[PDB]
Design a protein around this ligand. Structure first.
Ligand SMILES: CCNC(=O)c1cc2c(-c3cc(S(=O)(=O)CC)ccc3Oc3c(C)cccc3C)cn(C)c(=O)c2[nH]1
Length: 110
């Protein structure tokens, strides 16, 4: 059922924000601060920024109708990272590590 799916999505998000994954999850906790970092073209390349704090809000306020909507936002956050950055950048490697955690937990959802 849809409500059961979202309860499991809450657990996945809790796992992505947990201390065990912090070494690679931290660049995704908050929006990219393009202005402070001097990434002048970030909002030109990334039309729909996404981060775990936004996913946390949409989950708390029940803005996701189903698990697929939650998965779309999480994957959009990783896709933005792959889209913007060169493949050798440390953040791209951190995103792949966190995405392996998300994809595993999302696939194992009962
Ligand atoms: C081609 C150029 N790319 C970028 O400099 C770039 C930066 C980022 C960051 C990012 C956001 C912050 S923050 O201060 O905003 C909040 C924490 C701080 C560091 C960040 O990255 C770094 C990381 C993760 C490790 C070492 C060095 C840096 C600059 C996030 N994400 C998701 C990106 O895609 C992205 N790209």
């Amino acid at each position: 059922s849809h409500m059961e799916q979202l309860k499991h999505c809450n657990g996945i998000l809790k796992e992505l924000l947990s201390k065990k994954h912090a070494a690679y999850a931290w660049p995704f906790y908050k929006p990219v601060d393009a202005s402070a970092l001097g990434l002048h073209d970030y909002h030109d390349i990334i039309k729909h920024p996404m981060d775990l704090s936004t996913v946390k809000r949409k989950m708390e306020n029940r803005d996701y109708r189903d698990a697929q909507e939650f998965a779309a936002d999480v994957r959009l956050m990783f896709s933005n990272c792959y889209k913007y950055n060169p493949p050798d950048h440390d953040v791209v490697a951190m995103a792949r590590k966190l995405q392996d955690v998300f994809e595993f937990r999302y696939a194992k959802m009962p």
